[PDB]
């Protein structure tokens, strides 16, 4: 996250850190005690699915404070329409091997209904994006979780003010000062409405974070609510990676 601030410990309790062989891979969002939403591209190069770990209740990567909860990832589900190395359909649904325990430091973000998200949440201007990603373009990643308030653009305005499909939205700033960044992909774009927070976007990727003339690109979660809900009602399948038809 470029140009944000430290998320005070416990204020982003849905944030997930994804690790592969102990190394930071991506972020994610907890939406229930066994389900995490992330970005499909996070998984393009995984060789051994057994070494993927999700961590909830994380804050300062330098220390263990006892609020962290680690889980193996049992299933990584990607839409059939996602093509590795690209932006469109950049979403993944992750089933944990065992539920996390909800606590003051581990709470799911609400996955909204599609209508509500389209009719209401899409018009809330500012939302929060978070992660342990790079603090600057070509810079070191963060040791404490960072958060940034970003404004959402209508797609016509994004194209003017700068490919952007109906499966994405732009949010952020065109001056290079404030953006999500490498190391944040998969993390939440969370939107507040009347006292509750909801998942509206996933940090995706483009050519380079914090670039003058370019906004951050987020997966438009409202397009996937039915897809996600159906998968959460399904039984697990052998083999970690599952490609699931979309729509």
């Amino acid at each position: 996250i470029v140009g944000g601030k430290v998320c005070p410990k416990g204020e982003c309790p849905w944030q997930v850190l994804l690790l592969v062989n102990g190394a930071q891979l991506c972020g994610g969002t907890l939406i229930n005690t066994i389900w995490v939403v992330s970005a499909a591209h996070c998984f393009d190069k995984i060789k051994n699915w057994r070494n993927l770990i999700a961590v909830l209740g994380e804050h300062d990567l330098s220390e263990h404070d006892g609020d962290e909860q680690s889980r193996r990832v049992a299933q990584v589900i990607i839409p059939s329409t996602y093509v590795p190395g690209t932006t469109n359909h950049d979403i993944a649904l992750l089933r944990l091997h065992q539920p996390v325990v909800l606590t003051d430091h581990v709470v799911p973000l609400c996955l909204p209904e599609r209508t509500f998200s389209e009719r209401t949440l899409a018009f809330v201007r500012f939302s929060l994006v978070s992660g342990w990603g790079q603090l600057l373009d070509r810079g070191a990643t963060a040791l404490e979780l960072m958060v940034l308030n970003v404004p959402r653009l209508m797609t016509q305005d994004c194209l003017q003010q700068s490919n952007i499909t109906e499966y994405m939205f732009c949010a952020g700033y065109s001056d290079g000062s404030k953006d999500s960044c490498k190391g944040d992909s998969g993390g939440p774009h969370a939107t507040h409405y009347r006292g509750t927070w909801y998942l509206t976007g996933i940090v995706s990727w483009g050519q380079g974070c914090a670039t003058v003339g370019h906004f951050g690109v987020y997966t438009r979660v409202s397009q996937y609510i039915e897809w996600l809900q159906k998968l959460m009602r399904s039984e697990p399948r052998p083999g970690v990676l599952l490609r699931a038809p979309f729509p």
């Binding site: 416990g10 909800l102 606590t103 709470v107 009719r119 927070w197």
Partner: protein
């Protein structure tokens, strides 16, 4: 009704035939008798931040 100001619902809104609307709440919440408000029914409902909810309690 639901397309305008969320139908007055705090959370989710469905239109029905007539001038009819029903609000609904996510799992872990119940709808109050006002027909619009949602109140938690569990300790850790989705989308609430416990350290901030207890700072305001």
């Amino acid at each position: 009704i639901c397309v305008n100001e969320n139908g007055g619902c705090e959370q989710y809104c469905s239109d029905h035939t007539g001038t009819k609307r029903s609000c609904r709440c996510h799992e872990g919440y119940s709808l109050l008798a006002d027909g619009v408000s949602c109140t938690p029914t569990v300790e850790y409902p989705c989308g609430k931040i416990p350290i901030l909810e207890k700072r305001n309690a």
